[PDB]
Amino acid sequence: AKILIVEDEPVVREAIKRILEREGYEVVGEAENGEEALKKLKEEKPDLILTDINMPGMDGIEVLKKIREEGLKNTPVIMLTAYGEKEDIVEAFKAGADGFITKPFDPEVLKEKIKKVLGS
Fold it and tell me: The CATH number of the domain where 28 resides is what?
């Protein structure tokens, strides 16, 4: 499976990338902001997008909404937080998130949730 990561914090971004790769996933892009997210969505046609809930400018829910507006087939989105930020769980699921991960640095939890969403 091909994964696009949307995460503004560079070291967190790289850690997630490497964890995905250790779990056998192809990381087909890394986006630091919404502009890059939407550009790489169209260029790479990922099987799944992982998006931080909290990013500068256009926040994770707004990125999610724009991804869902593009309406490309098989573009599930899982939200994540690197800091236990759970305040926007509702708004993410209401806006069409397929999942919301609070333990993104546990390779097994990440793989389990991706596998589930991809299978659904």
Answer: 3.40.50.2300
Query: Quick one: tokens of 57?
Result: 């400018």
Q: Which residues contact 110 (CB under 8 A, 6 or more apart)?
A: 16, 19, 20, 23, 101, 103, 104
Task: Give the angle subtended at the CA of 31 by the CAs of 30 and 34, to the nearest 5°.
Answer: 160
> What is the experimental resolution, given in Å to one decimal place?
1.3
- Domain residues for the domain of 9 are 2-119
Q: Take residue 78 and report the two structure tokens written for it.
A: 């899982």
Query: Encoding tokens for residue 55?
Result: 């990013």
Q: In the PDB record, what is the listed experimental method?
A: X-ray
CB atoms within 10 A of CB 52: 24
Q: Which amino acid is at 65?
A: K
